[PDB]
Design a protein around this ligand. Structure first.
Ligand SMILES: Nc1ncnc2c1ncn2[C@@H]1O[C@H](COP(=O)(O)OP(=O)(O)OP(=O)(O)O)[C@@H](O)[C@H]1O
Ligand SMILES: [Zn+2]
Length: 64
């Protein structure tokens, strides 16, 4: 069933919104709902996304 992926937690009912970046796939650390809420609750946390390339995977969390 599950693997090594990491789904949302604020909802635990959703994986994590995703977007497409030129040949690459962009995932988010929080779903669209919790994402907006993250702005509320999170304000400045859990803010992170993962980009997948047609060859390698990447992470872009703590950017500051
Ligand atoms: N739902 C989310 N969950 C967690 N973090 C998010 C979420 N959405 C945005 N972020 C944070 O804000 C940034 C994402 O904004 P994003 O870069 O995807 O807009 P963009 O339009 O795709 O960028 P660009 O304009 O260069 O294409 C990331 O650094 C990420 O950490
Ligand atoms: Zn969520």
């Amino acid at each position: 069933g599950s693997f090594r992926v990491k789904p949302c937690v604020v909802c635990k009912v959703a994986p994590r919104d995703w977007r497409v970046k030129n040949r690459h796939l962009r995932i988010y650390n929080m779903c669209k709902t919790c994402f907006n809420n993250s702005i509320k609750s999170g304000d400045d946390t859990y803010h992170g996304h993962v980009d997948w390339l047609m060859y390698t995977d990447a992470k872009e969390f703590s950017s500051t």
